[PDB]
Design a protein around this motif. Structure first.
Motif, PDB file in Angstrom:
ATOM      1  N   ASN A  82       0.772  -1.241   0.000  1.00 31.51           N
ATOM      2  CA  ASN A  82       0.000   0.000   0.000  1.00 31.51           C
ATOM      3  C   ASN A  82       0.795   1.277   0.000  1.00 31.51           C
ATOM      4  OD1 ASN A  82       0.491  -0.927   2.886  1.00 31.51           O
ATOM      5  ND2 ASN A  82      -0.301   1.129   3.255  1.00 31.51           N
ATOM      6  N   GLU A 129      -1.175   7.679  11.716  1.00 25.85           N
ATOM      7  CA  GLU A 129      -2.466   7.011  11.914  1.00 25.85           C
ATOM      8  C   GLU A 129      -3.627   7.792  11.296  1.00 25.85           C
ATOM      9  OE1 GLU A 129      -2.302   6.283  16.168  1.00 25.85           O
ATOM     10  OE2 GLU A 129      -1.325   4.314  15.817  1.00 25.85           O
ATOM     11  N   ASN A 136      -4.976   6.556   7.860  1.00 24.71           N
ATOM     12  CA  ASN A 136      -5.849   5.389   7.823  1.00 24.71           C
ATOM     13  C   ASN A 136      -7.347   5.714   7.706  1.00 24.71           C
ATOM     14  OD1 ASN A 136      -3.834   3.467   7.778  1.00 24.71           O
ATOM     15  ND2 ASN A 136      -3.477   3.692  10.002  1.00 24.71           N
ATOM     16  N   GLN A 137      -7.709   6.988   7.920  1.00 17.74           N
ATOM     17  CA  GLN A 137      -9.105   7.389   7.750  1.00 17.74           C
ATOM     18  C   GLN A 137      -9.457   7.704   6.290  1.00 17.74           C
ATOM     19  OE1 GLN A 137     -11.359   7.293  10.322  1.00 17.74           O
ATOM     20  NE2 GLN A 137      -9.667   6.306  11.457  1.00 17.74           N
ATOM     21  N   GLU A 181      -9.001   6.289   2.155  1.00 16.69           N
ATOM     22  CA  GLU A 181      -8.619   5.131   1.343  1.00 16.69           C
ATOM     23  C   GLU A 181      -7.390   5.371   0.474  1.00 16.69           C
ATOM     24  OE1 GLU A 181     -12.236   1.923   0.884  1.00 16.69           O
ATOM     25  OE2 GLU A 181     -12.293   3.690  -0.434  1.00 16.69           O
ATOM     26  N   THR A 205       2.739   1.834   9.729  1.00 11.95           N
ATOM     27  CA  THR A 205       1.542   2.401  10.366  1.00 11.95           C
ATOM     28  C   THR A 205       0.358   2.560   9.418  1.00 11.95           C
ATOM     29  OG1 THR A 205       3.004   3.663  11.808  1.00 11.95           O
ATOM     30  CG2 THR A 205       0.687   4.362  11.734  1.00 11.95           C
ATOM     31  N   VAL A 206       0.621   3.086   8.209  1.00 15.82           N
ATOM     32  CA  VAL A 206      -0.409   3.312   7.226  1.00 15.82           C
ATOM     33  C   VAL A 206      -0.812   1.988   6.552  1.00 15.82           C
ATOM     34  CG1 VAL A 206      -1.186   4.700   5.288  1.00 15.82           C
ATOM     35  CG2 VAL A 206       0.462   5.666   6.916  1.00 15.82           C
ATOM     36  N   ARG A 207      -2.125   1.720   6.524  1.00 11.66           N
ATOM     37  CA  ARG A 207      -2.728   0.553   5.883  1.00 11.66           C
ATOM     38  C   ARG A 207      -3.480   0.927   4.611  1.00 11.66           C
ATOM     39  NH1 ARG A 207      -3.669   0.606  11.087  1.00 11.66           N
ATOM     40  NH2 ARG A 207      -5.842   1.284  10.784  1.00 11.66           N
ATOM     41  N   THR A 208      -3.846   2.231   4.447  1.00 16.55           N
ATOM     42  CA  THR A 208      -4.517   2.706   3.249  1.00 16.55           C
ATOM     43  C   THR A 208      -3.473   3.036   2.140  1.00 16.55           C
ATOM     44  OG1 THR A 208      -4.629   4.847   4.310  1.00 16.55           O
ATOM     45  CG2 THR A 208      -6.549   3.390   4.590  1.00 16.55           C
TER      46      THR A 208
END
Length: 165
Positions: free
Chosen positions: A11, A110, A113-114, A116, A142-145
């Motif tokens: 990602n 973080e 992550n809110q 996409e 840390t970032v998943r988006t």
């Protein structure tokens, strides 16, 4: 869409690019600003993004601060992206030059992550004084988006890519 980005992880993508020029080209849904708690967009990414909006980002930010007070270090707010993006996510990374706590860099990331997908700079890098290699490490962990990182400095971009674990 975004083009010329090197894939670092599932990602996280990266490119040696001026984030203002990337924003004018891509016109993403979210452009991340490397903000301070006062939303005073004087220099670095903030100054450059604000200048591209003809100071409209600053006017909007001053109204936001007048109403809500300052952000927290590690915090964020969503405002208009003006001519650069649909929205601007103003994220406050710790400024180590101002003696702010580097442990807050994970909290700052973080906020991504809110959303996409985001066009973003490396938080706390540049005039914020943190080690950009460490910032990229915190970003990927840390970032998943989907984050498209625009690294202004060419030599830093090469060092980040060549040293990426």
């Amino acid at each position: 869409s975004f083009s010329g980005y090197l894939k670092l992880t599932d990602n996280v993508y990266i490119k040696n690019a001026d984030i203002v020029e990337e924003a004018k080209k891509v016109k993403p849904t979210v452009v991340v600003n490397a903000a301070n708690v006062y939303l005073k967009h004087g220099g670095g990414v903030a100054g450059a993004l604000n200048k591209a909006t003809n100071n409209a980002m600053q006017v909007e930010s001053d109204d936001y601060i007048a109403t809500n007070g300052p952000l927290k270090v590690g915090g964020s707010c969503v405002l208009s992206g003006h001519n650069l993006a649909k929205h601007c996510l103003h994220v406050v990374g710790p400024n180590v030059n101002k003696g702010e706590d580097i442990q807050l860099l994970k909290s700052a990331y973080e906020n991504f992550n809110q959303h996409e997908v985001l066009l973003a700079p490396l938080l706390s890098a540049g005039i914020f004084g943190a080690d950009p290699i460490h910032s990229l490490r915190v970003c990927v962990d840390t970032v998943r988006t989907n984050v498209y990182l625009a690294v202004f400095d060419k030599n830093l971009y090469d060092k980040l890519v060549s040293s990426f674990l």
